Amino acid sequence: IHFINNDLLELDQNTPLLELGILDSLSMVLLLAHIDQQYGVKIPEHEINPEHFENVATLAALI
Amino acid sequence: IHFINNDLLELDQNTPLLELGILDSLSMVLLLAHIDQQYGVKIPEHEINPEHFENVATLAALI
Amino acid sequence: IHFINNDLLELDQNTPLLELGILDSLSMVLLLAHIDQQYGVKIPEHEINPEHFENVATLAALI
Amino acid sequence: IHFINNDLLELDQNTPLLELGILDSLSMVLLLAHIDQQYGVKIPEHEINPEHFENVATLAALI
Amino acid sequence: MNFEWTHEQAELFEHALRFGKELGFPRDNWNALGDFGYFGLPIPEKYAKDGSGFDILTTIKIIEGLGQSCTDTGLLFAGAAHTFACSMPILEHGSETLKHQLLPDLATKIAANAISEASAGSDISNLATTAQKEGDYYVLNGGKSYVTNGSIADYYVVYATTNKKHGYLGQTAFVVPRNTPGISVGNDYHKLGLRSAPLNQVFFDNCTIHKDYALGREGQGARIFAASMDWERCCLFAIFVGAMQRDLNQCIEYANTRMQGDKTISRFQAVSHRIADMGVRLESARLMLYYAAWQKSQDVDNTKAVAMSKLAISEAFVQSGIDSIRVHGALGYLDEGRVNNSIKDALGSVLFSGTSDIQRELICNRLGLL
Amino acid sequence: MNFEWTHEQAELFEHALRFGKELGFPRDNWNALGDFGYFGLPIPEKYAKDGSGFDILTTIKIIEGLGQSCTDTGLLFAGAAHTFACSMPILEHGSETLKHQLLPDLATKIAANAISEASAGSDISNLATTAQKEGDYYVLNGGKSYVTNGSIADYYVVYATTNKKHGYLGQTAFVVPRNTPGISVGNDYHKLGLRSAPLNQVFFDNCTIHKDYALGREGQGARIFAASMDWERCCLFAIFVGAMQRDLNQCIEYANTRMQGDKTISRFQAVSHRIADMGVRLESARLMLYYAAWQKSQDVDNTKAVAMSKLAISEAFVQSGIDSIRVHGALGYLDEGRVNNSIKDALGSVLFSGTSDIQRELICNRLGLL
Amino acid sequence: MNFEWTHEQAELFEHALRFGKELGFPRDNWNALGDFGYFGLPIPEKYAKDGSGFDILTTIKIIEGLGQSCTDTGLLFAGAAHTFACSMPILEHGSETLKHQLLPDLATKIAANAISEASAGSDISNLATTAQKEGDYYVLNGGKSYVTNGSIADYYVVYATTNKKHGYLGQTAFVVPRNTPGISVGNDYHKLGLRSAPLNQVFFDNCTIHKDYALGREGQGARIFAASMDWERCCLFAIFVGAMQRDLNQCIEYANTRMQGDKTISRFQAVSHRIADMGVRLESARLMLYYAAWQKSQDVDNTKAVAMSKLAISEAFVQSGIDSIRVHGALGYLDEGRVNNSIKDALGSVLFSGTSDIQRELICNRLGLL
Amino acid sequence: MNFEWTHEQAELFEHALRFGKELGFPRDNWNALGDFGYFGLPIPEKYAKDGSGFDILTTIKIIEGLGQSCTDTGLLFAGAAHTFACSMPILEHGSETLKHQLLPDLATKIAANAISEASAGSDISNLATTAQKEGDYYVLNGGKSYVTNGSIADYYVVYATTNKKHGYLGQTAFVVPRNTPGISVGNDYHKLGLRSAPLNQVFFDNCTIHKDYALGREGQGARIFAASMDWERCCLFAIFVGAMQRDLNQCIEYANTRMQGDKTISRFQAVSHRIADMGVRLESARLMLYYAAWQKSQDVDNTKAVAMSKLAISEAFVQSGIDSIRVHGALGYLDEGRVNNSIKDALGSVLFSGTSDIQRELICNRLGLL
Ligand SMILES: Cc1cc2nc3c(=O)[nH]c(=O)nc-3n(C[C@H](O)[C@H](O)[C@H](O)COP(=O)(O)OP(=O)(O)OC[C@H]3O[C@@H](n4cnc5c(N)ncnc54)[C@H](O)[C@@H]3O)c2cc1C
Ligand SMILES: Cc1cc2nc3c(=O)[nH]c(=O)nc-3n(C[C@H](O)[C@H](O)[C@H](O)COP(=O)(O)OP(=O)(O)OC[C@H]3O[C@@H](n4cnc5c(N)ncnc54)[C@H](O)[C@@H]3O)c2cc1C
Ligand SMILES: Cc1cc2nc3c(=O)[nH]c(=O)nc-3n(C[C@H](O)[C@H](O)[C@H](O)COP(=O)(O)OP(=O)(O)OC[C@H]3O[C@@H](n4cnc5c(N)ncnc54)[C@H](O)[C@@H]3O)c2cc1C
Ligand SMILES: Cc1cc2nc3c(=O)[nH]c(=O)nc-3n(C[C@H](O)[C@H](O)[C@H](O)COP(=O)(O)OP(=O)(O)OC[C@H]3O[C@@H](n4cnc5c(N)ncnc54)[C@H](O)[C@@H]3O)c2cc1C
Ligand SMILES: CC(C)(COP(=O)(O)O)[C@@H](O)C(=O)NCCC(=O)NCCS
Ligand SMILES: CC(C)(COP(=O)(O)O)[C@@H](O)C(=O)NCCC(=O)NCCS
Ligand SMILES: CC(C)(COP(=O)(O)O)[C@@H](O)C(=O)NCCC(=O)NCCS
Ligand SMILES: CC(C)(COP(=O)(O)O)[C@@H](O)C(=O)NCCC(=O)NCCS
């Protein structure tokens, strides 16, 4: 996931995605799309939350 | 049918509609529409011809 | 002056230009322009009047 | 000169303005304008150079 | 792929068209709309005995018919904020008890959506309105700056920051009853158009509301908001397609009657081709409206079609209102002309539910643009 | 070929800019404009001790400065109808006694131009208002439908048919005093913009006026009208160039201050490039304004440049008023925003002095198009 | 009212998309299109063993897919003139023997539609091409000035005046075989775009053709022409919706890859919002295309929807071609860029099948404007 | 403030108008332009016996006259790159010996401006072309991707990075003679328009050039470039104002001659009002051109007026080329029509000297937008 660095930002597993603004309303759409093509996972609505999207490590966990 | 004089021209029953250009492609649409609202008649395709549309008198005949 | 027939109308010397609407505000400009190129005359303001512009004959007179 | 931080960036006297891209073609215009209103100085062309615009300290020097 | 409405849909549509002429705040017309079924259109019978449980297409088609026949566009706009920015997030994310509590009167009591602030408009990422939890209650603090239906609201759907560290996910949506102490409301703003839809500042000064008034899980607010904007941007703007058809109808009728030089002005192509372009943009906007409502019933991402529709419709409405005045001349500039209300309302429509600039940002996003 | 104003012109311009903040019908502001010299700008000292005898460029440049600094655009519009549709045809085609009679108060009494009728707007070729001569007097009959300054007018410049057979040359221009029996005036029309410029229906019911009130020879009226429209279309629209500069200034100031996401909105190219296009259209419109005023002082046909300027300026003003609101968001839609008056006034400006369609007809004509 | 394609339609659509990369006059690609079924799409099996008998929606959807995947737009344009301006009037107004004679090779031999003359373009009311009947034969005389497929045509659908006194009804449509003596053809015109669709002058010098080659009754030609333009304006322009999608796809891909200042250019709103507007106009144009094809299958007057679609699509195509170049910079101006063909072809598309001005005349008419 | 040209300027202007019809790479026409004085217009006699030493207004007015009368716009464009992107930076920042060396042949040898790279177009802040100093010489390395006059150039004005750490100030401008070993040039690019102005890739492979070929102090290059773009964006686009006047003249002449229905097409307002708007944009663009050239002679910041002029002119040129084709119908789409060259050249003009997007960035900047 250098995707977040190139596609969304143009960083490591502990950079706080929500706290510093990297995932917002638009970037989330790009991320959820990348998560569907690369890993085949379609993250259900219930599990979009600050636990899982705290950072890349927690995010990768849920994937 | 002072409709032809006001709506289409802004004339009598012997003025030649086709020969002098009063009924063309656009005016025909307005006329066929007026013939459907005022007299309830929907002139079929086969009978659009220079006999019936020679003038108002011949036209009224077909209506 | 078949100019009036082609350029302005797309008639004779007794057709009433003002009474029937042939010379208005716009057509006058085209006419005054033609009168300057063809006959070299630049009709002064005072002489634009219904006497001289009654028809082609009266108009030609003033030219 | 928190002007550079608010107006141009939305940093200290040793941050390298040219090396890190803070002064370019557009920001220079805004800066030269601010230097004319606040300090009355109109920096001549010859003295726009990397010595004087290395950073805020060198820049303030030339002012 | 077909463009045919069912017999039942055509009948509801002509029922909306016929209802238009049966019509401070016009409370009587608002109640008459309730009786017609306007606030009940997308509500299921499970939650209101006068709910219609219609699908999105039947909904918007009826709304389109109301926009065509009701001259008070502002009133339709007020009712649609209430239904689609408030009733729907309640239907879709409220507890079962809150749904049975709130919806029967909502489908028929008035609701207002409150997210905008002094420093948050196009960007709703950093809301200054806070909600601290205390025991079984939340304590709300902050001002909301442009609340449609503010002065007439019985409930506010408020979006507040519950956790600044979770950012985009640090926001919760609440239903704040009017009558919760600490609420004060400013006078209706004087504005360019839409006089029948009140617009107010609302301040919340230590409003204590029970846990059960929160919409969905804490931290869900930003996505609950996006989901209500998907309803408002799709369905509310059906009004403006209806209003454009009336506009076009009045320009056709006027251009065929008004004469300049014992010729009707429709014989000038500056007029008639202007009216042609009104009809092209209208058919474009109507079709994009229908397409967006269909996709919304289909379980795909429909945000791109919805942003496109809101854009196309609202921008066409602005052009429609300018052109309507141009066609009517001085008559359209005069108030009795009954024509200059379109431009006045249309300029609102390119702002609320997110400006035209913000819709394009959404469109770009859904197209893949980084 | 240069774009330099003289020292004296720059000084008059900054004097107009400074005058703006010293400001039913605002009679006090109107008198203050008279004292400043606004109605006297193109009048020679020969006919008014407070006439300025300025050339067209100095005139329009001062008017441009008033349009920039005075928020009441409607008031400037009223004063400019009075000066350029009425005072100028009096200066240019009135008898010497009528000039000494009427002008000293006009340069300082109020005048209104009346040609439009129920069935004559864009086409003024067949006026239903008649003037039959009887002895030393003319008897006027007919209604005028949109008279700016109607309710406040002391004099009307009326255009009537004296000879239906002479067509384009069968019309005479009169100065009808208010206080001529038979004049009745309707209440000020409620209209979209320009509240400070009254707009009225005026009826003339057997108004008997002395031969000496006629402007120029009988039958000259249509060309006297065209000559006054050359003044109104050239000089009145200087107001709107001034107003666009204020509009642009407020959008620059707002976009550099308003923040969304701890960035100022000018950092979005949807905003900033929109403001760029406001400045391009403004500079275009200002330059076409200056060019038209210069040609008017030059003894050539200047109608094409004047029609172009009125078109460019009025259409830019409409775009300016939409964009100003777009830039300011909800704030610009609110009345306190102090922004939505531009679009409201600008939509008038594409109608009076002849609609945008009619200016293009003139342009086409002067280009040679048959 | 739904926007769902059947399983079979989606499959034909992806079959058209896959076919694109299997591709003087490119006769080989033209034959490959015949094998794919392109000229057979709307032809019934009754008249060609390789006719598909598809409805209008399945037809245009396949054509849209070919326009997206085939870079030679001119070739698709040639094939669509042949099928919709020639094959269809033959199917709809030819004798049963002429249909069995001509159609099997047409569905698979090449046809060209010829009506335009030196003095007849937008106005086809007074055609200088005459057809005098003699016994069992007609004798054709006159030049046709812009015949697509002229040089490659085996048959011409010619429209000639048979009776100047019957005006709009004094015109007959003929199928003139190439190989009829008296036909001469000019060299392919050098033109801005569409190199693969030949455009020729054709002269007819005493061409004697048997009665049985006439299409429909004598005097029916003008309405047979209008009926073929209803096919060409509806179905041919499906190509350009396909081409716009490719255009948009290439601008999205380019804007997400091309960098200026270690940022991709899509991060500039001047670029991205430009691409957003490409997608809005495309979805608008596609929807108006679908709507027009559906109405055509419905037995109502569909001329207004067809004129609207041709207008919207062709004008969007012009804007698409400009914007595509703007997005790509110098790369899009260069031929290897593979981008500037859109604007070159699109400018044709606002002319043939009747200019944008003429479509609006139709739209005005169908709206009721006098 | 006046718009009067001196007797001498009018005479030079009609001399340019008369010169137009006296006209691979058209070397003969290029030499004829040299004899007329085209490359010598802004050069002082001090540096060329055939230099004219004209001021900017006389310069651009003559260029405007050449653009009106010479059909080969590409050739004028080539000559203007040579004079304003190359000769002027040499005049303004070259040593006295380099000026006497280079300018006499330049005013009469061909020069090409080279800054664009594979990854540098709109952003010229990080150039990959390097110049390392060694003793009394500089060693140049890197490719330039779009060099007008590349294949015919005797000298290249090259902009290279001399010091990556000084950023915007780490760039130097050089005059690289053709015949400096290590230069290779690609074949002329096939492009949409402007065939007579070659466009080439140039590679510099260890080009060693003497210190005395550098323009100005090391590190000055980016501002030397901005100063040459102030010349190119101001004066080169005078060509396109001249070409638009020819375009407009041909549309007036055509619309007054071409008939459809025994009426000339100018009687349709769709045509005539389209031509009116061509004249409005032209007068706007011409006036903004003149205004920018005057300010440039005045010692103020003139970048805003120059960016505005380039924008207005280039965008008008695109619209002019579309409209010219629309007016002429199929005739304008055909090459013999002699009309479709405008759109082909105009689309270049919104790219080079910086795209329309980049001009607005400049305009925004000079307006004060952060
Ligand atoms: C009639 C009306 C009723 C309303 N009702 C309600 C209501 O009931 N509830 C409610 O919460 N709000 C309501 N609003 C406000 C509405 O939601 C708007 O979103 C708000 O007015 C827009 O933000 P703003 O006014 O602060 O403008 P800003 O967000 O400050 O925008 C100013 C300008 O900057 C532009 N801009 C901002 N961000 C970007 C960006 N990222 N890219 C490009 N351009 C950008 C905008 O498009 C605009 O041109 C209403 C507004 C109106 C006019
Ligand atoms: C604020 C305001 C103040 C005014 N003040 C005055 C005043 O003091 N005195 C006065 O006499 N009048 C005044 N008027 C009226 C003014 O002179 C306008 O010309 C008049 O309103 C325009 O004509 P109309 O309204 O009858 O519209 P119409 O002439 O009926 O025009 C209706 C539509 O048809 C179009 N049209 C008409 N003819 C043509 C044509 N030949 N070609 C193409 N399109 C055409 C118009 O452009 C317009 O789109 C004022 C109007 C306004 C809005
Ligand atoms: C690529 C291409 C292929 C073609 N292929 C064929 C073919 O196979 N067969 C064929 O018969 N023709 C063909 N044509 C011609 C085509 O049918 C066009 O209709 C014709 O070119 C348009 O008429 P015109 O060129 O004579 O222009 P004109 O009709 O002279 O029009 C010139 C201008 O006047 C305008 N104008 C004309 N009448 C009106 C009106 N009433 N109201 C407003 N504006 C009006 C036009 O819109 C245009 O702006 C083709 C043209 C092109 C470009
Ligand atoms: C006919 C022709 C002749 C030329 N001759 C020369 C020559 O002699 N010498 C030379 O050096 N070059 C020349 N060029 C190139 C020219 O200088 C252009 O600037 C270059 O083509 C533009 O950059 P680009 O093509 O790399 O596009 P890019 O810079 O990649 O731009 C692509 C798109 O992104 C947009 N964009 C880029 N940056 C921004 C931004 N900050 N904000 C908003 N939008 C942005 C652009 O406007 C465009 O829409 C020529 C080009 C042409 C077409
Ligand atoms: C960034 C974003 C587009 C959020 O989009 P998202 O929640 O879909 O991810 C956001 O800034 C937005 O939608 N703003 C619109 C403001 C608005 O719609 N206010 C409506 C109350 S009338
Ligand atoms: C007046 C009219 C609109 C005829 O319309 P109609 O036959 O539907 O009544 C006519 O002038 C027309 O359609 N011209 C278009 C010319 C054209 O389409 N040529 C196509 C061959 S490419
Ligand atoms: C035909 C024409 C253009 C007359 O032009 P002309 O007198 O210059 O010849 C005329 O119809 C016209 O100017 N109408 C404009 C109406 C108008 O300007 N009313 C102004 C009072 S606000
Ligand atoms: C940022 C900036 C605007 C530089 O502006 P500046 O040097 O005036 O400060 C720059 O990116 C620019 O001007 N790019 C334009 C590219 C160009 O003009 N190429 C011309 C060779 S044809």
mmCIF file of C-alpha atoms in Angstrom, chain F residues 234-344:
data_model
loop_
_atom_site.group_PDB
_atom_site.id
_atom_site.type_symbol
_atom_site.label_atom_id
_atom_site.label_comp_id
_atom_site.label_asym_id
_atom_site.label_seq_id
_atom_site.Cartn_x
_atom_site.Cartn_y
_atom_site.Cartn_z
ATOM 1 C CA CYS F 234 -23.150 54.756 -24.622
ATOM 2 C CA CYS F 235 -23.058 56.760 -21.397
ATOM 3 C CA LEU F 236 -25.616 55.184 -19.068
ATOM 4 C CA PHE F 237 -23.904 51.784 -19.175
ATOM 5 C CA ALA F 238 -20.721 53.355 -17.768
ATOM 6 C CA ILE F 239 -22.528 52.826 -14.439
ATOM 7 C CA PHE F 240 -22.373 49.077 -14.913
ATOM 8 C CA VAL F 241 -18.657 49.016 -15.640
ATOM 9 C CA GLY F 242 -18.153 50.804 -12.322
ATOM 10 C CA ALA F 243 -20.444 48.330 -10.569
ATOM 11 C CA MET F 244 -18.591 45.356 -12.055
ATOM 12 C CA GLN F 245 -15.290 46.660 -10.670
ATOM 13 C CA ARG F 246 -16.814 46.838 -7.193
ATOM 14 C CA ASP F 247 -18.196 43.316 -7.763
ATOM 15 C CA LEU F 248 -14.750 42.059 -8.782
ATOM 16 C CA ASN F 249 -13.091 43.866 -5.864
ATOM 17 C CA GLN F 250 -15.483 42.222 -3.394
ATOM 18 C CA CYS F 251 -14.881 38.779 -4.937
ATOM 19 C CA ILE F 252 -11.101 39.191 -4.723
ATOM 20 C CA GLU F 253 -11.324 40.353 -1.119
ATOM 21 C CA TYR F 254 -13.748 37.572 -0.209
ATOM 22 C CA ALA F 255 -11.854 34.768 -1.945
ATOM 23 C CA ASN F 256 -8.618 35.822 -0.190
ATOM 24 C CA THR F 257 -10.328 35.813 3.249
ATOM 25 C CA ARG F 258 -12.940 33.037 3.182
ATOM 26 C CA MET F 259 -11.515 29.687 4.212
ATOM 27 C CA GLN F 260 -12.748 26.143 3.683
ATOM 28 C CA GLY F 261 -10.412 23.499 5.080
ATOM 29 C CA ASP F 262 -7.810 25.953 6.468
ATOM 30 C CA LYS F 263 -7.165 27.037 2.896
ATOM 31 C CA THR F 264 -8.605 30.173 1.303
ATOM 32 C CA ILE F 265 -11.129 29.481 -1.425
ATOM 33 C CA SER F 266 -9.031 31.396 -3.966
ATOM 34 C CA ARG F 267 -6.726 28.365 -3.893
ATOM 35 C CA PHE F 268 -9.452 26.455 -5.765
ATOM 36 C CA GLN F 269 -9.268 27.119 -9.486
ATOM 37 C CA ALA F 270 -13.064 26.775 -9.764
ATOM 38 C CA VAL F 271 -13.213 30.011 -7.726
ATOM 39 C CA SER F 272 -10.080 31.827 -8.860
ATOM 40 C CA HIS F 273 -10.405 31.155 -12.594
ATOM 41 C CA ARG F 274 -14.023 32.245 -12.295
ATOM 42 C CA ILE F 275 -12.762 35.559 -10.859
ATOM 43 C CA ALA F 276 -10.126 35.742 -13.602
ATOM 44 C CA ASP F 277 -12.927 35.583 -16.192
ATOM 45 C CA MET F 278 -14.748 38.354 -14.348
ATOM 46 C CA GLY F 279 -11.644 40.518 -14.797
ATOM 47 C CA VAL F 280 -11.233 39.610 -18.453
ATOM 48 C CA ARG F 281 -14.847 40.443 -19.334
ATOM 49 C CA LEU F 282 -14.567 43.655 -17.266
ATOM 50 C CA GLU F 283 -11.426 44.857 -19.045
ATOM 51 C CA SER F 284 -13.014 43.918 -22.358
ATOM 52 C CA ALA F 285 -16.204 45.786 -21.438
ATOM 53 C CA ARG F 286 -14.394 48.831 -20.088
ATOM 54 C CA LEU F 287 -12.218 49.040 -23.209
ATOM 55 C CA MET F 288 -15.249 48.752 -25.522
ATOM 56 C CA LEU F 289 -16.921 51.452 -23.454
ATOM 57 C CA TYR F 290 -13.977 53.838 -23.829
ATOM 58 C CA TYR F 291 -13.666 53.019 -27.528
ATOM 59 C CA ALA F 292 -17.363 53.787 -28.146
ATOM 60 C CA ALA F 293 -17.171 57.131 -26.306
ATOM 61 C CA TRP F 294 -14.071 58.163 -28.268
ATOM 62 C CA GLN F 295 -15.661 57.317 -31.625
ATOM 63 C CA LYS F 296 -18.736 59.325 -30.622
ATOM 64 C CA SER F 297 -16.527 62.450 -30.334
ATOM 65 C CA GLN F 298 -15.021 61.755 -33.780
ATOM 66 C CA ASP F 299 -17.701 62.326 -36.459
ATOM 67 C CA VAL F 300 -18.070 58.863 -37.924
ATOM 68 C CA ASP F 301 -20.906 56.384 -37.594
ATOM 69 C CA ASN F 302 -20.388 55.100 -34.042
ATOM 70 C CA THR F 303 -23.532 53.002 -33.742
ATOM 71 C CA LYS F 304 -21.688 49.674 -34.120
ATOM 72 C CA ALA F 305 -19.224 50.488 -31.334
ATOM 73 C CA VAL F 306 -22.064 51.743 -29.134
ATOM 74 C CA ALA F 307 -24.256 48.694 -29.670
ATOM 75 C CA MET F 308 -21.236 46.467 -29.037
ATOM 76 C CA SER F 309 -20.403 48.281 -25.790
ATOM 77 C CA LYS F 310 -23.967 48.120 -24.453
ATOM 78 C CA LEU F 311 -24.127 44.414 -25.305
ATOM 79 C CA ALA F 312 -20.734 43.521 -23.838
ATOM 80 C CA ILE F 313 -21.287 45.606 -20.694
ATOM 81 C CA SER F 314 -24.841 44.473 -19.965
ATOM 82 C CA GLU F 315 -24.130 40.802 -20.595
ATOM 83 C CA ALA F 316 -20.961 41.007 -18.501
ATOM 84 C CA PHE F 317 -23.009 42.590 -15.743
ATOM 85 C CA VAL F 318 -25.408 39.618 -15.720
ATOM 86 C CA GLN F 319 -22.486 37.166 -15.585
ATOM 87 C CA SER F 320 -20.824 39.351 -12.952
ATOM 88 C CA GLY F 321 -23.928 39.181 -10.754
ATOM 89 C CA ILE F 322 -24.254 35.399 -11.038
ATOM 90 C CA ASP F 323 -20.525 34.847 -10.396
ATOM 91 C CA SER F 324 -20.503 37.294 -7.473
ATOM 92 C CA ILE F 325 -23.152 35.152 -5.793
ATOM 93 C CA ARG F 326 -21.378 31.912 -6.675
ATOM 94 C CA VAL F 327 -18.146 33.202 -5.090
ATOM 95 C CA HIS F 328 -19.862 34.333 -1.862
ATOM 96 C CA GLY F 329 -21.997 31.141 -1.429
ATOM 97 C CA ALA F 330 -25.023 31.424 0.843
ATOM 98 C CA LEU F 331 -23.699 34.766 2.009
ATOM 99 C CA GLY F 332 -24.233 36.174 -1.478
ATOM 100 C CA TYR F 333 -27.779 34.814 -1.655
ATOM 101 C CA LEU F 334 -28.692 36.615 1.577
ATOM 102 C CA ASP F 335 -29.705 40.260 1.377
ATOM 103 C CA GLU F 336 -27.315 41.399 4.106
ATOM 104 C CA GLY F 337 -24.542 39.861 1.976
ATOM 105 C CA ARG F 338 -24.943 43.079 -0.066
ATOM 106 C CA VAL F 339 -24.215 41.195 -3.306
ATOM 107 C CA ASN F 340 -27.388 39.968 -4.937
ATOM 108 C CA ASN F 341 -28.333 43.485 -6.121
ATOM 109 C CA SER F 342 -25.988 43.134 -9.103
ATOM 110 C CA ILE F 343 -27.881 40.281 -10.770
ATOM 111 C CA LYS F 344 -31.150 41.996 -9.969
#
